[PDB]
DNA sequence: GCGGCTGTCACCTGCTCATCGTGTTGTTCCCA
DNA sequence: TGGGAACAACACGATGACCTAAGAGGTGACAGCCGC
């Protein structure tokens, strides 16, 4: 399986595939339900329908093996051959392939220069076309032929003059004789009108026919190949008159003749000449056609494969028909399409045999063409061929593309064996690496192992008896299942897998019930809440599979998220509300025994049980040898002449009992903790534990924290009641006064001083003031010991706006058509919304529900594109010896001359290693290529630096893809990135996870358009696709003097640069809110009007580092405006993929074509080669691609076909005859092979 | 020869069932 | 096995002559065809 190539399928190739010809449009006999002969589903050409049988029955006996029968012609062998055996049908009239012609423009042929309409006319027998002209013989006989045409013109004139003499005689005779008769007053004038009618008729008819001959003559004079005679009468005239010099045809026969005669070398030569010297559109068209011409020229596959004379038939078992109950049949649409084409082919053969007129044979040939077109693609041209209902039929190419196609429904994602699912319930008694799975589910998944163990343990004498008893559900079966499930890791999974911590391996323990028991704090990795959610489950089988499961995927190991490195499996909700109650202060908690001193914590809990001490009362507790005091409290160590071993001596601390209990959950070596560990400090402590202590102890500490959090959450006293929702007394008076102001504004509106818009905006301002005032008063009112206050301030569940709506005020809401209701909801949910208030409030609820429903699929599509782009960027190198990096701001924000760590070092500079040693005082503060953790940050910010040079993938220069050292440390594992890490998929998943929760879009229209650039996920797709921003704003090309040349017809802003440069201008709208004044000094890389700068501009005028910085900053802008945190590396992966190609110009020397976005790598190597030969090298404009385009440009065509545009991709791959090498991730899961990543690398293989 | 605009190709998404136009031939049944 | 009758095949070609309803996507990317 070294490679897989596709080209054109000749007639000979199709004949070589086949074993027989399908001649009848018949599938099976409706009565006897058997294959017919030489039809669809036939048994002579395809394989036997029954294993080891033949049609007639002479060799129905199974003994025979591989022989051919002597009566029916069916060989005796297996019945699966019908899946593999193929046939063909010989067409009478050749037809064109609807892919290679009448398709996407770049693949529309262009080998024969013809417009789409001209080919539409030729192919579907509506216009003729010349396949050959004897120009040399035509010119040789042109003296003779023009003399002959002059002779015919003179004969026409001679008989015309004889008829003119006869007309004069007739006129004289009729005039004279009628005048002599005088039967009427105007006999002479009446017959003068008659004779003038005859004379005019002959004049006009003679002119018509001599002009007809002139048209035929000059048409023959100017007659070349690829010339269409739309009118058949004129073609008949030409064939009758000057035949034997030119040859014409209709339909695909003409195209076949041209593709056979036409040679490509000379065409490529002229195309190279014109592209070398071309202007405007003509050059672009020339190079576009040259692409296809060179594709056919370089390769051995001939263009004649683009016209078809034989059609292959897919094996019958891939298009089966089956008896449905009620005497019915369910059959594949392919059978109907094959029947249509065979019907029309046979009717055409009949018509040819009878020598039918041209019209009938032409109609039948056109119909056969349309039939094969529907067979290959039903929807490209005309109306589709519907099947049973009005719905369209399924074409052979419709079975490859689309969401439900073969690639995207059967080769990437498969239904699997040894799998189960069920609802998910919380087991709070589980260890981090444990899952409780129902009894029946465990029995079903582990069946074969259970039978093997039952037989081995002598509970059964044979495997079938073991199966019988397992089905019967005996007790010994259940004991054996308990024995066997041990040491078999089990992969739990949730439906939407937004990242790698969405499938996790657990150790299975056998449990009763009908639901799966899961750990309480792995609910954020899965996003699984217990509201009816379901969990799927899989069982690895091979030793390697389960070894990887336990080592890599085990839930105990997966504690840190890959998106930012913060721990994800940490306590939350009630657990944190319990540890917060444990370590909170004594405020409003009526302490007892405050100020007392205890000789141990055991004595403290004695006092607590006695009821004379509180868990949260300030008391002086002594801690024994081993306890490590707080880091902050150490410098206030006990005063004594002797040197006290603060690290390892008994000490005393004015702590609280709850904190002394909390610090027993953490490991003994951990320093004491003496502050409210609500939610954020717990995250910090868990991060420190993960980054400092080994994983087993971190899991044990997490378990202890879980147990303590639940235990103390039960006793916290947090219980929601209608009194615990405290409506502030402030709300009444505030809402009444602002209501009075609203009344005044309404009165001044109804009096006519203001407009309705002014009244609105005034009331929105008034009620925003009222809402915020009530919010702050509500925050002030409740104590900090309140239930809701406790769960919010502890960071368990809740925000302050939610509390505002519940307790104080709901406020203004999104009116219909995304507006702001002037009058707000002046009532919280506790007080009770009115009727109209509720009706108004449901608007935003509905809108948000619909928005979420759509945004799920939107983010899914975005993640699909990101994965397809970034896939195969795999760490293959331990260390490239580069010394380049990014100059990232290490400690900026010198507001009042104070060096402060930047506000986003966690996402940007953290985890990125160091290019080289940093020295500010003549000594190495940070050694080279060392993990850049917080300690180095404190050192460098203290010593005053404002930048740092970090290794990165963007600046990585390695022979084999990316290297571990430049990427940094894996944000998921903490340690250095391991070689073989599928970093691209990790980056794509990291950017895709928060996509659903962005929720950034305009709340109200606000009477603004264009200025409001797209917000949220639309913005992210806009940046990642390289699409020009909606609110585009030009960016100055060079430093210069900029002024306004506004014209009433069209406003303009014109900048002329200094340094003797050419002027530039930008057309701008009237509503521009210009951020640059007139006649001012702009610089090389500055904006002009308010908007969104194009990434293309920033790549063009500034450079490549500038576009990288701009894109990363612009995506992080929205991401960190939400609060989502993604490391900059995950964006940098996509940015690196987007800038890997260059558009080439001045390319005749470098031996390639201008354009074609040659790869940067390719451009460089071939310029090196041409310079080595001696010729100068070509030049390159850096190009910023999109994600769809950058993915579709893959060297491997399997991946491109799998992603999108299967028809176009496969057609181009066939034209180019380009093979696919196995290297890649996607294209190695299509073939079903070990991926070139993780432990599948040849090093580990 | 070079623009607009104007379509056309990509993507994103999901159990009932109505007749002719005549007349004849040969097999294959159904009854007895 | 006789007649009595059901389907699958066939061969011809009854003085008169035309659909049908269904049917609101949206957004990019682009290359033609038509206009200057
Ligand atoms: Mg749920
Ligand atoms: Zn046989
Ligand atoms: Zn590197």
From Swiss-Prot:
At the top level, the lineage of the source is Bacteria
Q: Give the cofactor note.
A: Binds 1 Mg(2+) ion per subunit.
Q: Which Pfam families match?
A: RNA_pol_Rpb1_1 (PF04997), RNA_pol_Rpb1_2 (PF00623), RNA_pol_Rpb1_3 (PF04983), RNA_pol_Rpb1_4 (PF05000), RNA_pol_Rpb1_5 (PF04998)
Q: Where is this region: Disordered?
A: 379-399
Protein family (similarity comment) = Belongs to the RNA polymerase beta' chain family.
Q: How does it assemble?
A: The RNAP catalytic core consists of 2 alpha, 1 beta, 1 beta' and 1 omega subunit. When a sigma factor is associated with the core the holoenzyme is formed, which can initiate transcription.
Protein's UniProt name? DNA-directed RNA polymerase subunit beta'
């Amino acid at each position: 399986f070294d490679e897989l190539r596709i080209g054109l399928a000749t007639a000979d190739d199709i004949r070589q595939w086949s074993h027989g010809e399908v001649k009848k449009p018949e599938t099976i006999n409706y009565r006897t339900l058997k294959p017919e002969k030489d039809g669809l589903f036939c048994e002579k050409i395809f394989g036997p329908t029954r294993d080891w049988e033949c049609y007639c029955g002479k060799y129905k006996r199974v003994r025979f093996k591989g022989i051919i029968c002597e009566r029916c012609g069916v060989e005796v062998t297996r019945a699966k051959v019908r899946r593999e055996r193929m046939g063909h049908i010989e067409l009478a009239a050749p037809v064109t392939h609807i892919w290679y012609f009448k398709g996407v423009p770049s693949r529309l042929g262009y080998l024969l220069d013809l417009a789409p309409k001209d080919l539409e006319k030729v192919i579907y027998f509506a216009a003729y076309m010349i396949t050959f002209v004897d120009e040399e013989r035509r010119t040789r006989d042109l003296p003779s032929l023009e003399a002959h045409v002059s002779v015919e013109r003179q004969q026409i004139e001679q008989r015309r003059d004889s008829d003119l003499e006869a007309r004069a005689k007739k006129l004289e005779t009729d005039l004279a004789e009628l005048e002599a008769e005088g039967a009427k007053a105007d006999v002479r004038r009446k017959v003068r009108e008659g004779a003038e009618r005859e004379m005019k008729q002959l004049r006009d008819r003679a002119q018509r026919e001599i002009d007809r001959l002139d048209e035929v003559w000059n048409r023959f004079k100017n007659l070349k190949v690829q010339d269409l005679e739309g009118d058949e009468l004129l073609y008949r005239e030409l064939r009758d008159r000057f035949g034997t010099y030119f040859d014409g045809s209709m339909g695909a026969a003409a195209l076949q003749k041209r593709l056979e005669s036409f040679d490509l070398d000379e065409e490529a030569e002229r195309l190279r000449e014109i592209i070398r010297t071309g202007k405007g559109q003509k050059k672009t068209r020339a190079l576009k056609r040259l692409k296809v011409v060179s594709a056919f020229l370089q390769t051995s596959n001939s263009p004649k494969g683009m016209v078809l004379d034989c059609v292959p038939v897919i094996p019958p078992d891939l298009r089966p028909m089956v008896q449905l109950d009620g005497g019915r049949f369910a059959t594949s649409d392919l059978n109907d399409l094959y029947r249509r084409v065979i019907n029309r082919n046979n009717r055409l053969k009949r018509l040819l045999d009878l020598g039918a007129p041209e019209i009938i044979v032409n109609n039948e040939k056109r119909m056969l063409q349309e039939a094969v077109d529907a067979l290959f693609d039903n929807g490209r041209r005309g109306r589709p061929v519907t099947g049973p209902g009005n719905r369209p039929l399924k074409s052979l190419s419709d079975m490859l593309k689309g969401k439900q196609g073969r690639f995207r429904q059967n080769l990437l994602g498969k239904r699997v064996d040894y799998s189960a699912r069920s609802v998910i319930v919380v087991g709070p008694q589980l260890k981090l690496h444990q899952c409780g799975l129902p009894k029946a589910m465990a029995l079903e998944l582990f069946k074969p192992f259970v039978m093997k163990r039952l037989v081995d343990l002598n509970h059964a004498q044979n495997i079938k008896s073991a199966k019988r008893m397992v089905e019967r559900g005996r007790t010994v079966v259940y004991d054996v299942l308990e024995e066997v499930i041990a040491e078999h890791p089990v992969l739990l999974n949730r439906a939407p897998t937004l990242h790698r911590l969405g499938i996790q391996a657990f150790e299975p323990q056998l449990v009763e019930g009908k639901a799966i028991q899961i750990h309480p704090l792995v609910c954020t990795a899965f996003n699984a809440d217990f509201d009816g959610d379901q969990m799927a489950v899989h069982l690895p089988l091979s030793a390697e599979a389960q070894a990887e499961a336990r080592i890599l995927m085990l839930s105990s190991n997966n504690i840190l998220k890959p998106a930012d490195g913060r721990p994800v499996t940490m306590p939350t909700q009630d657990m944190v509300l319990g540890l917060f109650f444990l370590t909170t202060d004594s405020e409003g908690r009526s302490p007892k025994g405050e100020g007392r001193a205890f000789g141990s914590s055991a004595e403290a809990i004695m006092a607590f049980d006695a009821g004379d001490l509180t868990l949260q009362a300030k008391i002086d507790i002594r801690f024994p040898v081993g306890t490590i005091p707080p880091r902050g409290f150490e410098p206030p160590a006990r005063e004594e002449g002797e040197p006290e071993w603060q690290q390892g001596d008994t000490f005393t601390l004015k702590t609280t009992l709850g904190r002394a209990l909390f610090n027993e959950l953490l490991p003994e070596d951990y320093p004491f903790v003496d502050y409210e560990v609500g939610k954020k400090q717990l995250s910090e402590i868990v991060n420190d534990l993960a980054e400092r202590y080994p994983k087993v102890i971190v899991a044990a500490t997490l378990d202890n924290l879980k147990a303590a959090g639940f235990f103390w959450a039960t006793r916290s006293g947090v219980t929601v009641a209608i009194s615990d929702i405290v409506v502030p007394d402030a709300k009444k008076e505030i809402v009444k006064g602002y209501e009075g102001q609203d009344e005044k504004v309404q009165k001044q509106y109804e009096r006519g001083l203001i407009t309705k818009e002014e009244r609105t905006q005034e009331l929105i301002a008034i009620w925003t003031k009222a809402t915020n005032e009530v919010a702050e008063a509500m925050n002030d009112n409740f104590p900090k010991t309140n239930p809701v206050s406790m769960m919010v301030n502890s960071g368990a569940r809740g925000n302050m706006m939610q509390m505002r709506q519940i307790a104080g005020m709901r406020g203004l809401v999104s009116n219909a058509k995304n507006e702001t209701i002037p009058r707000p909801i002046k009532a919280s949910f506790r007080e009770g919304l009115s009727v109209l208030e509720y009706f108004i409030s449901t608007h935003g609820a509905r809108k948000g529900l619909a928005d979420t429903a759509l945004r799920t699929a939107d983010s899914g599509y975005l993640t699909r594109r990101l994965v397809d782009v970034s896939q195969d960027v795999i760490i293959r190198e331990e260390d490239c010896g580069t010394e380049r990096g990014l100059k990232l701001p290490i400690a900026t924000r010198d507001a009042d001359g104070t060096l402060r760590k930047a506000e986003d070092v966690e996402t940007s500079v953290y985890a990125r290693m160091l290019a080289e040693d940093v020295v500010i005082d003549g000594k190495v503060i940070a050694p080279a290529n060392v993990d850049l953790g917080d300690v180095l940050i404190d050192a460098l910010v203290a010593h005053g630096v404002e930048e740092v040079k970090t290794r990165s993938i963007l600046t990585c220069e390695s022979q084999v893809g990316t290297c571990a050292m430049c990427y940094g440390r894996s944000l998921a594992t903490g340690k250095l990135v391991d070689i073989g890490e599928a970093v691209g998929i990790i980056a794509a998943q990291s950017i895709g996870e928060p996509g659903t929760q962005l929720t950034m879009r305009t709340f109200h229209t606000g009477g603004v358009a264009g200025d409001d650039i797209t917000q949220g996920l639309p913005r992210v797709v806009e940046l990642f696709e390289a699409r020009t921003p909606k609110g585009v704003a030009p960016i100055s090309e060079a430093s210069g003097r900029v002024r306004i040349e506004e014209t009433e017809k069209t406003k303009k802003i014109v900048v002329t640069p200094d340094d003797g440069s050419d002027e530039t201008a930008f057309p701008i709208s009237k509503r521009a809110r210009l951020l640059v004044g007139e006649g001012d000094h702009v610089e090389v890389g500055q904006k002009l009007t308010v908007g969104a700068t194009n990434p293309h501009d920033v790549l063009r005028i500034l450079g490549q580092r500038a576009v990288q910085v701009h894109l990363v900053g612009e995506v992080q802008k929205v991401y960190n405006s939400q609060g989502v945190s993604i490391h900059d590396k995950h964006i940098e992966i996509i940015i690196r993929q987007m800038l890997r190609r260059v558009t080439i110009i001045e390319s005749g020397d470098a031996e390639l074509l201008p354009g074609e976005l040659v790869e940067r790598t390719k451009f460089e190597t071939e310029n090196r080669r041409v310079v080595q030969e001696g010729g100068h090298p070509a030049s390159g404009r850096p190009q910023l691609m999109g994600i769809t385009k950058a993915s579709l440009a893959t060297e491997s065509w399997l991946s491109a076909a799998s992603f999108q545009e299967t028809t176009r991709v496969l057609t181009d791959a066939a034209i180019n005859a380009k093979s696919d090498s196995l290297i890649g991730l996607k294209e190695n899961v299509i073939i079903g092979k070990l991926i070139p990543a993780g432990t599948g690398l040849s090093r580990y293989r």
